[PDB]
Amino acid sequence: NRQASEFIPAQGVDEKTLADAAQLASLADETPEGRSIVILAKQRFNLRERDVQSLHATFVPFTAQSRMSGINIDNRMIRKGSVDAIRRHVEANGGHFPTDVDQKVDQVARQGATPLVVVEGSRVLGVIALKDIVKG
Ligand SMILES: Nc1ncnc2c1ncn2[C@@H]1O[C@H](COP(=O)(O)OP(=O)(O)NP(=O)(O)O)[C@@H](O)[C@H]1O
Structure with a gap:
């Protein structure tokens, strides 16, 4: 399975703020992973x-x-x-995906985590790296 392990703010964002938005934005998702993130802030x-x-x-x-x-x-x-998913949501609002946030998503992947991206309105507040419950 997949679970959020760490979140990082976007360009100029605070880490506490990013964890909070990922939690409430996941209260509406019925996916088991959306609970994994609501936990991520919970322990942190x-x-x-x-x-x-x-x-x-x-x-x-x-x-x-x-x-x-x-x-x-x-x-x-x-x-x-998804990072591609959030970039499309920002463009529809007419926002833009900051380079620093795209870099945080990629370093999340380079670290073997699945980088989700979180925004408020049309701007990304931070990126989230999930650890994989199962790994070969
Ligand atoms: N709570 C969440 N809120 C928003 N996006 C999420 C959440 N949890 C996971 N995601 C992202 O949505 C992607 C899942 O999209 P999708 O590929 O359509 O589902 P899936 O993995 O095939 N379903 P499953 O068969 O259960 O694995 C995940 O890889 C995450 O990057």
Whole structure:
């Protein structure tokens, strides 16, 4: 299986902020890995999932075809998915993928992890490296 092990902020982003957005944007995904990330911040920050309907917010379902899930709330929007997936989401909003964030995604892969990318609105806040539960 795949689980988030570490997250890194994008260009000018704080690591704590990145872990938090990955957690709430995963509350809406029904994939088992989306729970793996909600754990990742849990052990690192010891925080709890955020109730979207208590904020009158919305969950954004996770689809594998785009490889993306997220969450919407009355003051923010969050999206997370594959690096190619997030780049397309930013361009549709009209945002851009910062070089530093693309570099963090690649170093996540060069390290044998699956780099997901997380954005807020149309800009990437950080990249997430997942360790593989199973490895040959
Ligand atoms: N909680 C999540 N939210 C957004 N994206 C995720 C999440 N978990 C994983 N992803 C990314 O979405 C990709 C999965 O997309 P996809 O290839 O369509 O599913 P899949 O791996 O074939 N499904 P499975 O058969 O269970 O492995 C993963 O490789 C991650 O990079």
